[PDB]
């Protein structure tokens, strides 16, 4: 099993971008997933993350009313939709996996995530 990301690269401020990551076959596809991300010189942050078993999702303050997920089944991808992006968004995206739910404690806990994909890096620039 692998998570592969896409959708990296460098976007204008006030911009929006498009994450996503694939898992392989039908893993995870009733479970859960998160999107973290790892700015310059930090730790890893979480962003969001969904339970895919009812679809239910869960975000950083920083991100609210901002950053959405979407989901496509029949290509067991989940995808990271990020609009008005700040420079301060600048980061290496990572998705995570993990079997059995996430609720509004855990999902944030990166280390209750133990699949990961390579990270796509983010660069917002005018």
């Known amino acids: 099993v692998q998570l592969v990301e896409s959708g990296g690269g460098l976007v204008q401020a006030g911009g929006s971008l498009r994450l996503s990551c694939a898992a392989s076959?039908?893993?995870?596809?009733?479970?859960?997933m998160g999107w973290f991300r790892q700015a310059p010189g930090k730790e890893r942050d979480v962003v969001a993350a969904?339970?895919?078993?009812?679809?239910?999702?869960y975000s950083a303050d920083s991100v609210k009313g901002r950053f959405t997920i979407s989901r496509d089944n029949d290509k067991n991808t989940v995808y990271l939709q990020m609009s008005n992006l700040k420079p301060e968004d600048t980061a290496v995206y990572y998705c995570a996996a993990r079997e059995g739910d996430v609720g509004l404690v855990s999902y944030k806990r990166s280390s209750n995530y133990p699949y990961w994909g390579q990270g796509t890096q983010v660069t917002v620039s005018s």
């Open positions: 969904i339970n895919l078993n009812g679809g239910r999702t």
């Open positions: 076959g039908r893993s995870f596809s009733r479970d859960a």
